[PDB]
Amino acid sequence: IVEGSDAEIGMSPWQVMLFRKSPQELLCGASLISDRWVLTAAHCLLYPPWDKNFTENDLLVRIGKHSRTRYERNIEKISMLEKIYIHPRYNWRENLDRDIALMKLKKPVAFSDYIHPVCLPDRETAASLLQAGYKGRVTGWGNLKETWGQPSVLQVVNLPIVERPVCKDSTRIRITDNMFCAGYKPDEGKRGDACEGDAGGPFVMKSPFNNRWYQMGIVSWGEGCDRDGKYGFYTHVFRLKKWIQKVIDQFG
């Protein structure tokens, strides 16, 4: 997360860290969506150009975490995967279209002060909150700046949704209806973006109707991090809700 600040404890209790312990690395963020399911970006788990092809045993999911580099004995939950489901039309070759994956946990988790699932949007919530200029929140332990620079503690930034014609004009890459973009325009002055190591993490919005937090997006890609005239791209969760429901229906 670039130009954000430290999360307060328990501010984002659906935040999941995808972590390998040997070699020791933060792979990605992710989100808890029920007692047994975790949502992430497909490229966190499958990206052939970088020899990335994780199966259930290559990965541990860490829930309830605040520190990046410290085992938090009395707050965190470590779960193991039973199954990985990558979206069938995920496009790693071109533009990361449908960059989404589900992970089924081996045992259900119990919720706590620090561990709680985020809501998925219904039609009205998705429609009414996902409007240009409306702000959502992105969190993660990824890079504090574009580099080829990591935080100790979970980072958070609030960012406005951008009009689609502006998202289209910002980039040479073919973008789809399964993506939205967020961040400040050049003449809006303000700064902020997600970055490497934040992928799979949730873009969330708080509904004024019921005071619940909803996940609208999944950190997917960008061109560098926090550049003028460039925006972060996010997997459009509502657009892909049918698939999520189908997977949880079929295999849950």
């Binding site: 990206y47 150009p49 040479r172 490497e196 190591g197 890609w221 560098g224 972060g232």
Partner: peptide, 8 residues
């Protein structure tokens, strides 16, 4: 290595 898209 960059084919324009930078995955996060």
């Amino acid at each position: 290595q960059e084919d324009q898209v930078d995955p996060r």
